[PDB]
Design an enzyme around this catalytic site. Structure first.
Site, PDB file in Angstrom:
ATOM      1  N   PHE A   1       1.742  -5.911 -16.027  1.00 60.79           N
ATOM      2  CA  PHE A   1       2.892  -6.329 -15.235  1.00 60.79           C
ATOM      3  C   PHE A   1       4.020  -5.325 -15.393  1.00 60.79           C
ATOM      4  CE2 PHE A   1       6.948  -8.362 -14.793  1.00 60.79           C
ATOM      5  CZ  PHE A   1       6.816  -9.029 -13.610  1.00 60.79           C
ATOM      6  N   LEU A   2       4.630  -4.959 -14.253  1.00 61.93           N
ATOM      7  CA  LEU A   2       5.887  -4.179 -14.254  1.00 61.93           C
ATOM      8  C   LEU A   2       6.874  -4.893 -13.348  1.00 61.93           C
ATOM      9  CD1 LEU A   2       3.485  -1.921 -14.606  1.00 61.93           C
ATOM     10  CD2 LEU A   2       5.439  -0.365 -14.521  1.00 61.93           C
TER      11      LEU A   2
ATOM     12  N   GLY B   1      -4.277 -10.635  -0.959  1.00 58.01           N
ATOM     13  CA  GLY B   1      -4.084 -12.025  -1.419  1.00 58.01           C
ATOM     14  C   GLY B   1      -2.780 -12.109  -2.115  1.00 58.01           C
TER      15      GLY B   1
ATOM     16  N   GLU C   1       3.108 -11.049  -2.064  1.00 59.17           N
ATOM     17  CA  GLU C   1       2.009 -11.127  -1.064  1.00 59.17           C
ATOM     18  C   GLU C   1       1.431  -9.733  -0.959  1.00 59.17           C
ATOM     19  OE1 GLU C   1       3.945 -12.689   2.341  1.00 59.17           O
ATOM     20  OE2 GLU C   1       4.353 -14.656   1.359  1.00 59.17           O
ATOM     21  N   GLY C   2       0.258  -9.558  -1.530  1.00 64.59           N
ATOM     22  CA  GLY C   2      -0.390  -8.227  -1.524  1.00 64.59           C
ATOM     23  C   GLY C   2      -1.217  -7.987  -0.294  1.00 64.59           C
ATOM     24  N   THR C   3      -1.842  -6.818  -0.255  1.00 61.82           N
ATOM     25  CA  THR C   3      -2.753  -6.412   0.857  1.00 61.82           C
ATOM     26  C   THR C   3      -3.870  -7.469   0.998  1.00 61.82           C
ATOM     27  OG1 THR C   3      -2.331  -4.086   0.317  1.00 61.82           O
ATOM     28  CG2 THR C   3      -4.317  -4.559   1.634  1.00 61.82           C
TER      29      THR C   3
ATOM     30  N   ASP D   1      -4.097   4.277  -0.028  1.00 57.01           N
ATOM     31  CA  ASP D   1      -3.033   3.458   0.587  1.00 57.01           C
ATOM     32  C   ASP D   1      -1.781   3.526  -0.270  1.00 57.01           C
ATOM     33  OD1 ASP D   1      -1.797   1.924   2.560  1.00 57.01           O
ATOM     34  OD2 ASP D   1      -2.394   0.065   1.580  1.00 57.01           O
TER      35      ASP D   1
ATOM     36  N   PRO E   1       5.574   3.032  -1.103  1.00 51.24           N
ATOM     37  CA  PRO E   1       6.569   2.694  -2.119  1.00 51.24           C
ATOM     38  C   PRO E   1       6.303   1.344  -2.809  1.00 51.24           C
ATOM     39  CG  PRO E   1       7.624   3.823  -0.337  1.00 51.24           C
ATOM     40  CD  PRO E   1       6.188   3.619   0.104  1.00 51.24           C
ATOM     41  N   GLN E   2       5.791   0.373  -2.070  1.00 50.57           N
ATOM     42  CA  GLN E   2       5.579  -0.982  -2.647  1.00 50.57           C
ATOM     43  C   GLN E   2       4.485  -0.983  -3.688  1.00 50.57           C
ATOM     44  OE1 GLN E   2       5.850   0.153   0.774  1.00 50.57           O
ATOM     45  NE2 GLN E   2       6.914  -1.552   1.819  1.00 50.57           N
TER      46      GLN E   2
END
Ligand SMILES: Nc1cc(Br)ccn1
Length: 293
Positions: free
Chosen positions: A77-78, A20, A16-18, A122, A125-126
């Site tokens: 992708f990581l 979407g 769940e990102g900032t 912004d 760590p995430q």
């Protein structure tokens, strides 16, 4: 379910990102596994230009998809972020040589993006992603300029203030690349101590958290601060604390760099380019982290 998702095989929700939902997806034709982020003509122009901002320490923006009045970003992708790695590494901490490697690499990514007039704004760590080869990469550069940083995510989750620079909190309209140095300094400190440096839970608590560690800012350390929109003369006056108390057991080389990354005056705050030349990085190496995927 837009038709373009036909281009992908496994389209699994991973986070769940900032802005979407974030999916893991495989392209059927190319076979490449990507991160698909679900998210307005100025935004389209701003975000499309980021396809040409490529660096080894920046998560690559592969494609922009605008369809059915909906927007999707396709990224490299990581497998892990620094938040989960920090949680996984809590009993014994991340080894200093790996902290050092991580900071050095993230400063390279900042130096690249800042040289191209792009900000993150912004960092947290995430959005710092790691792989098994000892690399770290910054995710979501440039998105703030394109679509703002909201108070609450699409899921109503609170967007963290912990890494936010004081000029943002004090209402500066025209803050710039120094805000990213501040955030990275806060992340550096968290990697070393295993606790967030300034875990505020409102804008005033964030600002007072900073003030209690670094001293309430004044015109001596930060010329012009008393004229900032959200500065109040009634803010309590706290004395500044020694970094030796703040980030033990970091050595004088690391404490010196951290102090420069956390200068109040954004014009005094060290640049990414200058930080790369700091003595702290004289013995930098690239160790391999133990990852469990
Ligand atoms: N100074 C700034 C920076 C961004 Br990104 C957005 C708005 N104002």
């Amino acid at each position: 379910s837009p038709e373009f998702m036909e281009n992908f095989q496994k389209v699994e929700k991973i986070g769940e990102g900032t802005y979407g939902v974030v999916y893991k997806a495989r392209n059927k034709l190319t076979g490449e596994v990507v991160a698909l982020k679900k998210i307005p003509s100025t935004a389209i122009r701003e975000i499309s230009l980021l396809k040409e901002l490529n660096h080894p320490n920046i998560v690559k923006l592969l494609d922009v998809i605008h369809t059915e009045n909906k927007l999707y970003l396709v990224f490299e992708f990581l497998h892990q972020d620094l938040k989960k790695f920090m949680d996984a590494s809590a009993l014994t901490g991340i080894p200093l040589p790996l902290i050092k490697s991580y900071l050095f690499q993230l400063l390279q990514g900042l130096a690249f993006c800042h040289s191209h007039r792009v900000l993150h704004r912004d960092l947290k760590p995430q959005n710092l992603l790691i792989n098994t080869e000892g690399a770290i990469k910054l995710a979501d550069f440039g998105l703030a300029r394109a679509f703002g940083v909201p108070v609450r995510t699409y899921t109503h989750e609170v967007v963290t203030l912990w890494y936010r620079a004081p000029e943002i909190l004090l209402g500066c309209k025209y803050y710039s690349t120094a805000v990213d140095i501040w955030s990275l300094g806060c992340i550096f400190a968290e990697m070393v101590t295993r606790r967030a440096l300034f875990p505020g839970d409102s804008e005033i608590d964030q600002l007072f958290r900073i003030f209690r560690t670094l001293g309430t800012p004044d015109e001596v350390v930060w010329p012009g601060v008393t004229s900032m929109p959200d500065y109040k003369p009634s803010f309590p006056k706290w004395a500044r604390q020694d970094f030796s108390k703040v980030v033990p057991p970091l050595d004088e080389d690391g404490r010196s760099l951290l102090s420069q990354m956390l200068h109040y005056d954004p014009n005094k705050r060290i640049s990414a380019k200058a930080a790369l030349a700091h003595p702290f990085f004289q013995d930098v190496t690239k160790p391999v982290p133990h990852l469990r995927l």
